[PDB]
């Protein structure tokens, strides 16, 4: 009911890194404090590392196990965007803002970081556990994928959106907004594929899959809180970032056809500023009674 519509929306959102000139960001970058520059670098590396997993494994593995030519094509298109567009875009932002040696060090740090690794390996673990012709294991991986696309990225997206909403780092913020817009549709699409599997299950199996999804969400959420404090306490933003994580967790759940887990909260306004019945002809004698 939905693949051709998503095909259309995906291909019409096509874009390339070269379209946004990045050099003018140096005019606001130079005015940020060390903690702001440090947080930005670390967040950016976090997003880059997670998105690489999605391009190399997450999207291609789902495309491999999903049946249907049109679904495989949409999934291929999404994998292409991860590897050919998003990955080059993140690299471009880095090369503009930091010298080569600084980039290498930030990636070394984030590669060793406990909270980034915990979530990266949890997601990758579920992708590696998919078994041929087993729709339960595929569903679990789809849940992991939706959580990455619609939830885990957002502790990171917060900061570029925060600057973007203030008039700072506008070129890289525009790029991030385009990336985020792609991840949103990726999350919704994979969510619909997961619901299709979920709806084929018994009531007991459904309850079991719901417990899986909520348990996974809880593990990731508790690690996100730690990840958040680790990066954002030094710039005083953690309270507001936490509200943004929960709001996006609820969107991820709704993508999977589940109820929201967290109470509704308002979001930081700066970040917000950054963000047929069958026709049957009348046959006459229908006017007479």
């Amino acid at each position: 009911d939905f693949t051709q519509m998503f095909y259309n929306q995906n291909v019409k959102q096509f874009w390339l890194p070269e379209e946004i000139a990045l050099n003018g960001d140096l005019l606001t970058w130079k005015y940020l404090g060390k903690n702001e520059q440090d947080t930005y670098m670390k967040v950016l590396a976090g997003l880059t590392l997670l998105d690489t997993e999605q391009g190399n494994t997450g999207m291609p593995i789902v495309a491999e196990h999903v049946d249907g030519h049109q679904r495989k094509a949409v999934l291929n298109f999404m994998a292409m965007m991860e590897n050919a567009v998003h990955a080059k875009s993140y690299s471009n932002i880095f090369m503009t803002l930091a010298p080569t040696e600084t980039i290498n060090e930030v990636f070394e740090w984030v590669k060793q970081n406990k909270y980034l690794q915990k979530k990266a390996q949890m997601i990758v673990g579920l992708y590696k556990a998919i078994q041929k012709d087993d729709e339960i294991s595929l569903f679990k991986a789809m849940v992991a994928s939706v959580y990455l696309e619609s939830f885990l990225f957002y502790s990171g997206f917060y900061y570029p959106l925060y600057f973007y909403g203030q008039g700072k780092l506008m070129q890289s913020g525009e790029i991030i907004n385009l990336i985020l817009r792609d991840e949103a549709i990726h999350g919704v699409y994979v969510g619909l594929l997961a619901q299709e599997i979920y709806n084929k299950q018994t009531e007991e199996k459904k309850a079991e899959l719901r417990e899986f999804a909520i348990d996974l969400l809880n593990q990731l959420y508790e690690n996100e809180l730690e990840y958040t404090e680790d990066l954002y306490d030094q710039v005083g933003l953690s309270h507001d970032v936490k509200k943004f994580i929960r709001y996006n967790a609820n969107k991820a759940l709704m993508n999977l056809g589940f109820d929201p887990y967290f109470e509704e909260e308002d979001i930081n306004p700066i970040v917000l500023n950054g963000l047929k019945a069958t026709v049957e002809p009348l046959k006459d004698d229908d006017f007479y009674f």
Partner: protein
Amino acid sequence: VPKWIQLNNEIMIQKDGKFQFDKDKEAVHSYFVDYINQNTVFFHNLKEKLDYLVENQYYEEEFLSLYSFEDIKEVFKTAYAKKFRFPSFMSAFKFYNDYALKTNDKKKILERYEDRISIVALFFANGDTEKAKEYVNLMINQEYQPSTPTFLNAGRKRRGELVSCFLLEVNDSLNDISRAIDISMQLSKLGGGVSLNLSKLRAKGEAIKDVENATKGVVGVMKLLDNAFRYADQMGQRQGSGAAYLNIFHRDINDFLDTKKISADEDVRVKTLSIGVVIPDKFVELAREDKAAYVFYPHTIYKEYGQHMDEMDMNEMYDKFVDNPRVKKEKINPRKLLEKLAMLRSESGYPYIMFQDNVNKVHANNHISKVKFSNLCSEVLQASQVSSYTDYDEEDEIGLDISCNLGSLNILNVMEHKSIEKTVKLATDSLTHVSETTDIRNAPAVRRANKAMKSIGLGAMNLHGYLAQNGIAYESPEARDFANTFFMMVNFYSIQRSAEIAKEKGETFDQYEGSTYATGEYFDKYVSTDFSPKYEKIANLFEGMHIPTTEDWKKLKAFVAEHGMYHSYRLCIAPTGSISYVQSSTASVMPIMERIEERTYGNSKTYYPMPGLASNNWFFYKEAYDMDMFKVVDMIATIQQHIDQGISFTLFLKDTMTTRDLNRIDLYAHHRGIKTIYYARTK
């Protein structure tokens, strides 16, 4: 989760294969012994409570000053002597969430059900302690329910207006359009739903002073009204709701309908303004004969004849319009337009359908004006005269803009108490009081029509509840016989009360002398046809009550001829959406949508069974979607023959049926005399 929430959810947990309906009662107890009694604000006596509510700008002191405190205490004691108990959790929840008065911070409950009823009764009586006690007994017995505006806002300082619906006539001018937008914003600020007749506005491609193809049509005015209703949204609490009505012979009728198509562009789509279509008998005749019809440009007709297209009878002037070369018209297929109406109603439930000839063949005030459109709920059908809002520093010709006060009889409680007459008369008095104390300072035509017409709307609720709790199928002929007798009694006693008020005040409504009430024509079918029950079961249901005969109707006709009628319009059956919960009643005279409804509040879910639902009456509580819409049309026509205004008739459709079935239902409704059709809700 709260204890009462768990007890209410325990209903669906079946025990021995049966629903645990009694658990619902337990929930109410919990809801009172854990939330309401703890969150209520108690005073040492009633004096301290009244003083606190008066000085803190919760209550108007004027209506309370008409009684000595002893009389107010007696009224409150009469209210509390009944020991009223909410039989379902949802009734109490809905009252204490939507209608009970709370503090400024909404942390505590200041008004109980008895307190609210006492305040409303004291406002109604206007200084009469015995009348206040009568109103208290009428409302605590739940025989009569004032509308949501009246029940919620009576006697409150921070209140809005007590009138629920307003109907505006928009003349074909920029000054009139701007005044209509202003009045719509003012009345939505007051909280009332506003309906506007756009049939007088000239269509798209008409001339504004000799420059042709200049008008934006009714769609531009529709966009303006939609933005006005979006802006005036009851201070952001309830979304601003407006209705636009267009005659089906208007040239813009397609574009009008295109405002509700799900594929409409943003420059055409209108989303907060309901749409209604007024269909004369000429359109149905043309569609029946498959003859191609003609939609007309209103301004050309006004230029040629001096009157608006909707100001005269299309059944007699359509051929003159078509044969007149000075009248501009476009060819349409009436059957294709009917199919478009059915498709639109299937997709979105719009437009409202108003069968103009069905309304005006029994309309008692055709001399004042024909009914050209309906309200936002498509049940108010009254004469309206358009206003001529002129330029600044020029006097405006103020017309009549429809406005009536709503109030519903609880059929189950009225018939259980065997008090059709007393309840009808007291409800008529309360609605007359609500009309008299209504004064709107920013809608001149509405104010003038309220002062002159004195129109009120006395509805009814719990028809299906009464029928199912008495072992009568809603589609059965016995149910239609009961509706015929009950609503003939309601009409008889409403006319009697209106004539008695006219006698006691020495005044009738404006232009009553030309009405069918004055000439005696209105009583024709009542002085020749007997409306006593034809079935023994219904007659037993009406035992202990004097069913009016043709002789009583003749006496009432003579009484009206001698004294006149105070109200131009008396009976209109509103949907009664949320106040039906508090009364433990089914919504309006419509059949129930579902036996048990699951509603999500906050993060919790609640189940409301239909009032009186049980094992023995499970199948008598037949869901509306499972019912034959033709028999529902028969019921609504049977009720409508005794209602001077319309009835909010919602169609309940299944997904399997086609637009042809919807068109057949609409045409059967038109054939059976249905005045208006409210909604096409698809399961």
